[PDB]
Amino acid sequence: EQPELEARVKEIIEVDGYQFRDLNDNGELDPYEDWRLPTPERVADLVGQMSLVEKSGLMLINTLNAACFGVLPAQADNYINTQHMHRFVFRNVVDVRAEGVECTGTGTPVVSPAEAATFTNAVQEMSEATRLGIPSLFKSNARNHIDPAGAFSAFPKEAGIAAAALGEQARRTGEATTGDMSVVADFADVMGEEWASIGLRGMYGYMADLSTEPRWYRTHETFTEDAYLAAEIMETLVQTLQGEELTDNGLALSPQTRVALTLKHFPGGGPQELGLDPHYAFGKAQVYPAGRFEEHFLPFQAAIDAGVSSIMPYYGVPVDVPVVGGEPGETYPHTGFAFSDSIVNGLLRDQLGFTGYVNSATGIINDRAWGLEGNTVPERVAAAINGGTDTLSGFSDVSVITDLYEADLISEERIDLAAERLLEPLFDMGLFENPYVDPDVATATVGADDHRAVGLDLQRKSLVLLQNEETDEGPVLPLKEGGDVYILGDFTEETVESYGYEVTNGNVAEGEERPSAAGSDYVLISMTAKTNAGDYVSDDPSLGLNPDHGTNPSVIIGDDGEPLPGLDGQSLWGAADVCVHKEGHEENPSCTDNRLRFGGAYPWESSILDFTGMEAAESWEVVPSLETIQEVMAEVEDPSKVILHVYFRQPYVLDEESGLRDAGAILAGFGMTDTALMDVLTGAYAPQGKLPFALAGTREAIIEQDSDRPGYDETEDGALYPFGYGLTYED
Numbered sequence: 001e002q003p004e005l006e007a008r009v010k011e012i013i014e015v016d017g018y019q020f021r022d023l024n025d026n027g028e029l030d031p032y033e034d035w036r037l038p039t040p041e042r043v044a045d046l047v048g049q050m051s052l053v054e055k056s057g058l059m060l061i062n063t064l065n066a067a068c069f070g071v072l073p074a075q076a077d078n079y080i081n082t083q084h085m086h087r088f089v090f091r092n093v094v095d096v097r098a099e100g101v102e103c104t105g106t107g108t109p110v111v112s113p114a115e116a117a118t119f120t121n122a123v124q125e126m127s128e129a130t131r132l133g134i135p136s137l138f139k140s141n142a143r144n145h146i147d148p149a150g151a152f153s154a155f156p157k158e159a160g161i162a163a164a165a166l167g168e169q170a171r172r173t174g175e176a177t178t179g180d181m182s183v184v185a186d187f188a189d190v191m192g193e194e195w196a197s198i199g200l201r202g203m204y205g206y207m208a209d210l211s212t213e214p215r216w217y218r219t220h221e222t223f224t225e226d227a228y229l230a231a232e233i234m235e236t237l238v239q240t241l242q243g244e245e246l247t248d249n250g251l252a253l254s255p256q257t258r259v260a261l262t263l264k265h266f267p268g269g270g271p272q273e274l275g276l277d278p279h280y281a282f283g284k285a286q287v288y289p290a291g292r293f294e295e296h297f298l299p300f301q302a303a304i305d306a307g308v309s310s311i312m313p314y315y316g317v318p319v320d321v322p323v324v325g326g327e328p329g330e331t332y333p334h335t336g337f338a339f340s341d342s343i344v345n346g347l348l349r350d351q352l353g354f355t356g357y358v359n360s361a362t363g364i365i366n367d368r369a370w371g372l373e374g375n376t377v378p379e380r381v382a383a384a385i386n387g388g389t390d391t392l393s394g395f396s397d398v399s400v401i402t403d404l405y406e407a408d409l410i411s412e413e414r415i416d417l418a419a420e421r422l423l424e425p426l427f428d429m430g431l432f433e434n435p436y437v438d439p440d441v442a443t444a445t446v447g448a449d450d451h452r453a454v455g456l457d458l459q460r461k462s463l464v465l466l467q468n469e470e471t472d473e474g475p476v477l478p479l480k481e482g483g484d485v486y487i488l489g490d491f492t493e494e495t496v497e498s499y500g501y502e503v504t505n506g507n508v509a510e511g512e513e514r515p516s517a518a519g520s521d522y523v524l525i526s527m528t529a530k531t532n533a534g535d536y537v538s539d540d541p542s543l544g545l546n547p548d549h550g551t552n553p554s555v556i557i558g559d560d561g562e563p564l565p566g567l568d569g570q571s572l573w574g575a576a577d578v579c580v581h582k583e584g585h586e587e588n589p590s591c592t593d594n595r596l597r598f599g600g601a602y603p604w605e606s607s608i609l610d611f612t613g614m615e616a617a618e619s620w621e622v623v624p625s626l627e628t629i630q631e632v633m634a635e636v637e638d639p640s641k642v643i644l645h646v647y648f649r650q651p652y653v654l655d656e657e658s659g660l661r662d663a664g665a666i667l668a669g670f671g672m673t674d675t676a677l678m679d680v681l682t683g684a685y686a687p688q689g690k691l692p693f694a695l696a697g698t699r700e701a702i703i704e705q706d707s708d709r710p711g712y713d714e715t716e717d718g719a720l721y722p723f724g725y726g727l728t729y730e731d
């Protein structure tokens, strides 16, 4: 009964034989401070006592990073006392800093697990110190995946976790449908304990988006293209991270909730047109040529039914999509999902039954109010809140919500309803009783030996064997013991040496002679492709306003009957950026798309996913360069002695002209260490993963495939490797 209670500013009061935290510091037990009453009654009493601005402060969520290790940043006082915010996004890398690190510049420091816990405890202490002592919630993007983070236990990327899951279901069933969720559960158990231990109880994620459009740069963090497998992953992720104890309101929230998920990006951010992402003005559009809008919010249905705490809608504009459960011929507003009542209030809450709160994507008011290009900031804030969005990521100006209330552009009925939905989980999660964590217990949880072992295990099972030729001497893989080995790509020489091979290193500096691979028993290449689009400028005549770069075929007709600027299907790629069309209320607006900060290629190269194409592209880079790989593969005798490990960050195309298909073995890796790849390469473990998305063999397939449809079975050329494909060793 008596829950653990910590209080560093307000004090504890004993009542009816129990102890309670006096958070209003009135000296008396208020029903909201009484942990014995149902959550609704505590909310009602708390909401009852709050000022208007106090309730408005709940509708904001903003970056609050530790600074230098783990001091509170400049804006903490302003956010907590002037804006009355209680929701923050924590973005520092958590790891052990190398000797010598001298905090300098205006970057974002690395902090140890205890330093992070110390910083988040300080924020909770500043929160306790506010008039009513409401606690704080921190959110974070994922931290547990290898970037091919810090001291968090390392796992393959999301698609690698699905690969492991599919492949373990096949090794026990001979079938790859929706996977063995024990793999996912085992992953999420490690993430939960490590996050909770630093006082990190909220997540911007995971992504339920489907990888049905291979040209979308964010396929790097999607699990799969299959709605049904996504649905099963979402279900297990919520059950493991939030728990299976549901409130009467149907939310998996207890004090035993380690991380409350904000599933993103509703209703599904996968089917972007030409793969262009709506962080940017040319990529506002989401299109559904195969009519799978219903399929794409299916994982969200599964997460909602398991009680996910929160939903983040995406920036995208759904084009000509029938309202689900509406009168025929009706379509959803051609505006960002977060501003459409039909989506946030109608689809999500009425049709899919969501009873939680809604968290906008970051920066929808100032930067990405798609469909509301001409509207003001106060107008955009009102439309988002009135459409159904309860908290605004990236907006930190509480006075705008209060001005809108006094101008009757938002009601007290709406703000109260927001306050109740945002406050509810903090209550069910037990943060009103104890919101603190032990820094020292963080140091013993984040990156524990058994946690790293579960990751390494998931790493080894994520690897997908695509190709393993049978030579005269048997299959290429596993490697035979010992030999001369050529390495190229991100291989650590000594690590490969340590398995007892004499290693020739083809990775040399620019001004240096690469040793030839001639006479090698084995060539190990580890390769990928990156975008390199940091030079992009929307209003530069040589780039975004360059007629030689073509036109943006995306058409979005505004509900008002006229096309959105730059999206009439005839305009220069850059013309959609506000710095070009200037329809806002600002003198010389800055460009939203410059430097393509978030990822993705130049929009006019978004369809170049084949390695030959990418080598030649302006804003794509093959690493190591396709030229070098091809030199190397010819210097060896039989290409059958080259083993390609490919990081398919996007469903890249092994095109026939590149010759990569001539390798004796090809593997799909979704993020792993040298030592985990070597253990599978040498046969200490057999590969058993299966593809969670299909791979194509021609650029024509990439351009023909329906952005909302999984696979390439509707194309002339079709798939090189189907979903669910993966070899193993056969002895």
Ligand SMILES: O=C(O)[C@H]1O[C@@H](Oc2ccc([N+](=O)[O-])cc2)[C@H](O)[C@@H](O)[C@@H]1O
Residues within 6 Å of the ligand: 089, 141, 204, 205, 264, 361, 362, 363, 393, 394
């Ligand atoms: O990380 C966030 O805040 C969330 O919003 C979006 O990412 C942004 C991050 C920073 C900024 N910014 O600094 O302006 C803008 C956008 C993503 O679409 C979403 O997946 C993510 O969880």
Ligand SMILES: [Zn+2]
Residues within 6 Å of the ligand: 025
């Ligand atoms: Zn006092």
Ligand SMILES: [Zn+2]
Residues within 6 Å of the ligand: 021, 022, 023, 024, 025, 026, 027, 028, 029, 030, 033
């Ligand atoms: Zn009190």
Ligand SMILES: [Zn+2]
Residues within 6 Å of the ligand: 412, 416
């Ligand atoms: Zn009221």
Ligand SMILES: [Zn+2]
Residues within 6 Å of the ligand: 053, 081, 082
């Ligand atoms: Zn105030």
Ligand SMILES: [Zn+2]
Residues within 6 Å of the ligand: 054, 057, 084, 085, 086, 130, 134
């Ligand atoms: Zn407050």
Ligand SMILES: [Zn+2]
Residues within 6 Å of the ligand: 217, 220, 599, 649
């Ligand atoms: Zn990427």
Ligand SMILES: [Zn+2]
Residues within 6 Å of the ligand: 235
């Ligand atoms: Zn189920």
Ligand SMILES: [Zn+2]
Residues within 6 Å of the ligand: 272, 273, 275, 276, 277, 278, 282, 283, 284, 285, 286, 316
């Ligand atoms: Zn788009």
Ligand SMILES: [Zn+2]
Residues within 6 Å of the ligand: 396, 397, 398, 399, 400
């Ligand atoms: Zn303000």
Ligand SMILES: [Zn+2]
Residues within 6 Å of the ligand: 406
């Ligand atoms: Zn009034």
Ligand SMILES: [Zn+2]
Residues within 6 Å of the ligand: 438, 440, 441
């Ligand atoms: Zn302690």
Ligand SMILES: [Zn+2]
Residues within 6 Å of the ligand: 193, 445, 448, 450, 451
């Ligand atoms: Zn543990």
Ligand SMILES: [Zn+2]
Residues within 6 Å of the ligand: 474, 475
């Ligand atoms: Zn054999």
Ligand SMILES: [Zn+2]
Residues within 6 Å of the ligand: 502
């Ligand atoms: Zn030696």
Ligand SMILES: [Zn+2]
Residues within 6 Å of the ligand: 548
């Ligand atoms: Zn020309």
